[PDB]
Amino acid sequence: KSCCSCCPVGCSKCAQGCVCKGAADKCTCCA
Numbered sequence: 001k002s003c004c005s006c007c008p009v010g011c012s013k014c015a016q017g018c019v020c021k022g023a024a025d026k027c028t029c030c031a
C-alpha cells in the first residue's frame, strides 16, 4: 500500500511526500 482513497496508489505529485487537504472521497491539485 501508499497514502489516499481519491488517487490510483502509483501517482507523479504524491510518489515520496502527500499535497491533498479533502484526503478519503475527491481532489482540485492532481488534474
Ligand SMILES: [Cd+2]
Pocket: 004, 005, 006, 007, 014, 020, 023, 027, 030
Ligand atoms: Cd489524493
Ligand SMILES: [Cd+2]
Pocket: 004, 007, 011, 013, 014, 030
Ligand atoms: Cd495524488
Ligand SMILES: [Cd+2]
Pocket: 003, 004, 007, 014, 018, 019, 020
Ligand atoms: Cd496523497
Ligand SMILES: [Cd+2]
Pocket: 019, 020, 027, 028, 029, 030
Ligand atoms: Cd491531489
